[PDB]
Amino acid sequence: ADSTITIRGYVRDNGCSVAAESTNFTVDLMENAAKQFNNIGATTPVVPFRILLSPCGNAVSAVKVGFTGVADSHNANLLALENTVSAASGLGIQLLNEQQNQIPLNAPSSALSWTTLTPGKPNTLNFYARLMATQVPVTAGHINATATFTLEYQ
């Protein structure tokens, strides 16, 4: 043992890279002109959007996903659009999970469920978004809104 090279390193646990996908509506006054379908008029060609959790860390095994945003005055489970003059009326965006069920908007941390992830290999969460009518009829206008995706780690 004439000389010795000693190596000392430390691997830090990393979180996850979250890439969001901006959803763009098209519809073009199809349902809006016809329905007119009570307050449960949640019939709109769902636009599939995904939240990319990639790449992630090896510790990230389970997380608590949940949405927060500005609710509608009529239906609390609907994300209200921008209250502008050029905007529409009597509409509220509904958010659905991969199993096509209504996700509780503005829900606390004690209501959300643990979405188990894959440690290492990239994860992907697929969600849907459609329009639900609160008032009737629906006037033609812009469809802009804002929301917030909270990723609560274990």
Binding site: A1, T4, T6, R8, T26
Partner: protein, 778 residues
């Protein structure tokens, strides 16, 4: 779905990926919808298609309708009016820059114009028992200079015994990016690839293997495959997945794959959309001379021969080695040497058999002319075999055998003045061998050696080395055995010794605050099987906070051999500071008692001024952060910024990304940064500025109110006094770094309005962050 044909202002997509939006004309052709788009060459090249991949596209006009569906095999297009988009499916074999880790040429930083100086003054004093004393002092001096893209260097040293300047090296290197090579002017050296290493002083244009991405350097099986439809290709090796990427329909080519010969064979699978699989395995074995398919390494040199001996001449010469990679694991090579009294030609040819192991065999003919004007012709052929890590753990790294004729002489042999170095006892046959064997989990057996024969004498050069390493948990059991027998001497010099390394790291808590976790004991006993036997116990480690100072204490005993015994003792200190290094060692061997001493360091002379630090190493990153003081650099041991706020990074890799990060915990309480982490991409021998804007002064959080209401979100705020600035968040709060004790504040959010002013109390100096409240003007 479908709409009547015509011009379409539609966003163009390439394999479900947006690119650009132009007016696309659709004509009636052979497809699904019965219509085909009319695109041009200039658009497809700016879309993702590599026009060089399609032979016959350069003949078409500038705005001619390219028949992609016919001219290009396995290519389909589709227009969709339902979502206003245009889906295309081009094979990835027609795309460029597929290499993972690829770095664009324009990102490469040529560096900054600055002077260079690297000192390393060492030497030792020996106190003999019977004889007297002996002082020695050797000072290094690596001068240098960078001018944009030119790198000047000048090596020289000074010596003292018990006395003048001796010159070493002086060159001027430059990297030629368009040629992907390097131009060396002055003192240099060639590669020992084909012909033996030659020291010279002239011009050399050789390809740099450092420019290529690390996922493309070295030989590796370039996997070619053709998929019918959209498939997902995955590649496994030794049970674990190594490669994974989805590919469009049509032919494809994978020229990545990190070189790992001793990892086993590749397992490729192409799972189609339906479920059909194309299972085929490609074996892996690599010889150091092999070139990857497409890679071309060359080395044209020209100058005078410079050895440094007084018994040698300075003849003119030329050397142009060339290597190229061919499909199916084939590799051709062989350069040519032309000189005044010597010439030589080489022919390579080498293939990766894979299942039988890679092999390359080249032959070099030489027409030499010895100093006595006696011509001698001859050839020299070498063999190079390699096999991957077998199932039993058999790793045949290299089996080499070179055979030269009786009339074969190297170029260096024809550079001497007198005959009787010798030209009547040239080397005949050399046999190299290096094989490692993994013995289970915690054991590895190492084997190596050489065997040289000479024309005339029946004498043989013999070297041999075998070492078995066992790893018991934390303890590393090392046992080696060497054997060196020269021809021009008598007796076999073989040494037999074992080493036991026991680190204290895994003996305590992993979170222990004791400095004993940074230490390790090393006991070794030696015996040359000829009377002499030694034994040495020693403990070494590091100290201080950043672990710069390296200590070592070892004492032992030696005796036998020829009747010479005595106890030993050694102590070494090696410190690396932010202003330079220092190394002092002391040796005690009863009869012999010496004392080592040496201080090295690096000096940079940039535009801003001068910065001290550790000894430079070819590529050095200059940190520029005026304001910081004791700023620790992450991933860098011993690197601290000076009092000015500047620093130098001795450790920097070329043609890759280097993360220059400053540890913000070590920053002053009156200093903050806009960005503490930056990346640099230096060329070989470059000096890149790593700038970090610092803010000297008090950090404060202001609450700006306008008309009994706080300022809106996203309101820009700039200081009149200092250059520093910030952005207003919620509740009209704004964080500012490096602010004066009192000064005017400018605010502008729409089209400036608000004008603030404040005067913090001088007593609030010993606070890292004070909060206040102010108003505006209009």
């Amino acid at each position: 779905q479908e709409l009547p044909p015509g011009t379409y202002r539609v966003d163009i997509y390439l394999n479900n990926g947006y690119m650009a939006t132009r007016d696309v004309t659709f004509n009636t052709g052979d497809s699904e919808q019965g219509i085909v788009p009319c695109l041009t060459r200039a658009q497809l090249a700016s879309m993702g298609l590599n026009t060089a991949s399609v032979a016959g596209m350069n003949l078409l006009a500038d705005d001619a309708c390219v028949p992609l569906t016919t001219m290009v095999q396995d290519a389909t297009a589709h227009l969709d009016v339902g979502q206003q988009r245009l889906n295309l499916t081009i094979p990835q074999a027609f795309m460029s820059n597929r290499a993972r880790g690829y770095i664009p040429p324009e990102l490469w930083d040529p560096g900054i114009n600055a002077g260079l100086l690297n000192y390393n003054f060492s030497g030792n004093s020996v106190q003999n028992r019977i004889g007297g004393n002996s002082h020695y002092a050797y000072l290094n001096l690596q001068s240098g200079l960078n001018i944009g893209a030119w790198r000047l260097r000048d090596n020289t040293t000074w010596s003292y015994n018990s006395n003048k300047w001796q010159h070493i090296n002086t060159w001027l290197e430059r990297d030629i990016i368009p040629l992907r090579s390097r131009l060396t002017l002055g003192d240099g050296y060639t590669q020992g690839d084909i012909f033996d290493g030659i020291n010279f002083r002239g011009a050399q244009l050789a390809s740099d293997d450092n420019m290529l991405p690390d996922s493309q350097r070295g030989f590796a099986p370039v996997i070619h495959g053709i998929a019918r439809g959209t498939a997902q290709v995955t590649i496994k090796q030794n049970g674990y997945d190594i490669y994974n990427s989805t590919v469009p329909p049509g032919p494809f080519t994978i020229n990545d794959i990190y070189a790992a010969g001793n990892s086993g064979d590749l397992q490729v699978t192409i799972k189609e959309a339906d479920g059909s699989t194309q299972i085929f395995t490609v074996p892996y074995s690599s010889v150091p001379l092999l070139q990857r398919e497409g890679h071309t390494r060359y080395s044209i040199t020209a100058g005078e021969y410079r050895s440094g001996n007084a018994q040698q001449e300075k003849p003119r010469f030329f050397q142009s080695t060339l290597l190229h990679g061919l499909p199916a694991g084939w590799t051709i090579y062989g350069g040519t040497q032309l000189a005044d009294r010597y010439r030589a030609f080489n022919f390579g040819i080498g293939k990766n058999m894979g299942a039988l192991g890679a092999l390359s065999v080249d032959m070099t003919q030489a027409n030499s002319t010895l100093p006595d004007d006696s011509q001698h012709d001859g050839q020299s052929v070498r063999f190079l075999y390699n096999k991957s890590l077998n199932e039993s753990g058999t790793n045949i790294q290299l089996v080499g055998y070179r055979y030269s004729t009786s009339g074969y002489f190297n170029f260096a042999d024809t550079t001497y003045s007198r005959m009787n170095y010798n030209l009547a006892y040239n080397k005949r046959g050399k046999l190299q061998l290096t094989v490692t064997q993994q013995l289970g989990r915690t054991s590895t057996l190492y084997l190596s050696g050489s065997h040289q024969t000479y024309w005339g004498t029946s004498n043989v050069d013999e070297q041999f080395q075998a070492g078995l390493n066992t790893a018991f948990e934390d303890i590393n059991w090392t046992l080696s055995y060497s054997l060196t027998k020269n021809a021009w001497q008598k007796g076999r010099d073989q040494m037999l010794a074992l080493n036991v390394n026991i680190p204290f790291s895994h003996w305590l808590r992993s979170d222990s605050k004791s400095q004993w976790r940074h230490a390790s004991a090393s006991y070794s006993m030696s015996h040359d099987l000829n009377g002499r036997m030694t034994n040495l116990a020693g403990v070494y480690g590091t100290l201080l906070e950043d672990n710069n100072l390296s200590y070592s204490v070892q004492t032992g005993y030696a005796g036998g051999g020829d009747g010479n015994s005595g106890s030993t003792g050694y102590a070494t200190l090696n410190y690396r500071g932010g202003y330079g290094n220092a190394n002092i060692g002391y040796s005690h061997s009863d009869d012999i008692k010496q004392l080592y001493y040496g201080v090295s360091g690096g000096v940079l002379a940039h535009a801003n001024g001068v910065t001290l630090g550790q000894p430079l190493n070819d590529t050095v990153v200059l940190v520029k952060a005026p304001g910081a003081k004791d700023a620790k650099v992450e991933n860098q041991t011993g690197v601290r910024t000076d009092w000015r706020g500047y620093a130098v990074l001795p450790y920097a890799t070329e043609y890759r990304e280097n993360r220059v990060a400053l540890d913000t915990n070590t920053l002053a309480d009156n200093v903050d940064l806009d960005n503490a982490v930056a990346n640099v991409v230096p060329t070989r021998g470059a000096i890149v500025r790593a700038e970090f804007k610092a803010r000297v002064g008090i950090k404060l959080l202001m609450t700006l109110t306008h008309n009994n209401k706080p300022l809106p979100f996203g309101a820009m705020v700039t200081s009149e006094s200092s250059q520093s600035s910030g952005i207003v968040a919620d509740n009209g709060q704004v964080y500012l770094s490096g602010m004066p004790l009192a000064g005017k504040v400018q605010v502008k959010w729409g089209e400036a309005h608000c004008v603030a002013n404040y005067q913090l109390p001088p007593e609030s100096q010993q606070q890292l962050l004070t909060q206040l409240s102010a108003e505006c003007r209009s």
